[PDB]
């Protein structure tokens, strides 16, 4: 599920809420 954050050039600030970079945007479990 996309979280609402791009990660093309920086990692996910939303890593704190569980979101990780895949396919240039931040996701939690799809």
């Amino acid at each position: 599920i996309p979280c609402g954050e791009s990660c093309v050039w920086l990692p996910c600030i939303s890593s704190a809420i569980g979101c990780s970079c895949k396919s240039k945007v931040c996701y939690r479990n799809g």
Side-chain angles (χ1 to χ4, degrees), residues 4-26:
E5 180 186 354
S6 172
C7 51
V8 56
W9 289 321
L10 271 76
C12 294
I13 297 155
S14 57
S15 57
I17 64 168
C19 305
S20 50
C21 192
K22 273 92 185 187
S23 306
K24 306 191 298 195
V25 306
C26 300

